[PDB]
């Protein structure tokens, strides 16, 4: 039922699978066309009985990581970042004796030609 509902996007509503056959100019042709399409849809849906791999996956609206998790983004590589910053302050101080305005591209950010 899940697989058939997914395959019949708007063809199923309120528990009734409905198919309007109007391809041909004759109702005698449209009955055959609709019968064939129903049989094909049912056959493809029954693939869900072969194995779990044919059971359609469920779409769950998974949230983004919460604020608590996002907080640790500041602490990832905390010790290494502290070491790098203390090392870099030396370079910043040395550069301040040559230029009025020091630049992140001068200290750590890589801006090349």
Partner 1 sequence: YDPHTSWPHVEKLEPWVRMAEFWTSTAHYEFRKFFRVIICKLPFQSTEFEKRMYDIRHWLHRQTSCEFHTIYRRNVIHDSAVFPTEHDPATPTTHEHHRMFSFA
Partner 2 sequence: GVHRVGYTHPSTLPVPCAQRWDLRLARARIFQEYIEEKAPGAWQLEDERSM
Partner 3 sequence: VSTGEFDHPPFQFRQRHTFNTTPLHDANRFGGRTAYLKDPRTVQFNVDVWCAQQTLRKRWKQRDWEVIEIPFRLVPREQQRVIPELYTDIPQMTDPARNDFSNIRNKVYDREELQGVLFPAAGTMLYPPLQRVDKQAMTLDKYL
Report the partner that residue 37 touches, choosing among partner 2, partner 1, partner 3, none (CB closer than 5 to 8 A by kind): partner 2
Torsion of CA 33, 36, 38, 42, to 10 degrees: -160
91 in Cβ contact with 99 (< 8 Å): no
Interface with partner 3, residue 15, by CB under 8 A: yes
27 to each of 30, 31, 34, 72, 113, how far by Cα in Å? Answer: 5, 6, 10, 66, 73
Q: How far is the CB of 46 from partner 1 (least distance, A)?
A: 5
Report the partner that residue 1 touches, choosing among partner 2, partner 3, partner 1, none (CB closer than 5 to 8 A by kind): partner 3
Part of the chain binding partner 2 (CB under 8 A), chosen from 43-51, 69-77, 82-90, 93-101: 43-51
| Nearest partner of 108 among 86, 77, 76, judged by Cα | 86
Q: Which of residues 81-110 bind partner 3 (CB under 8 A)?
A: none
Contacts to partner 1 by CB under 8 A? 35, 38-40, 42-44, 46-47, 49-50, 54
């Amino acid at each position: 039922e899940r697989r058939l509902r997914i395959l019949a996007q708007h063809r199923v509503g309120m528990g009734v699978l409905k198919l309007d056959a109007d391809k041909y100019e004759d109702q005698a042709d449209n009955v055959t066309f609709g019968t064939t399409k129903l049989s094909e849809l049912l056959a493809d849906a029954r693939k869900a009985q072969l194995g779990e791999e044919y059971w359609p996956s469920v779409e769950l609206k998974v949230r983004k990581p919460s604020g608590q998790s996002k907080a640790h983004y500041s602490l990832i590589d905390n010790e290494r970042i502290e070491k790098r910053s203390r090392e870099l302050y030396e370079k910043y101080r040395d550069a301040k004796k040559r230029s009025l305005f020091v630049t992140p591209m001068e200290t750590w950010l890589e801006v090349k030609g």
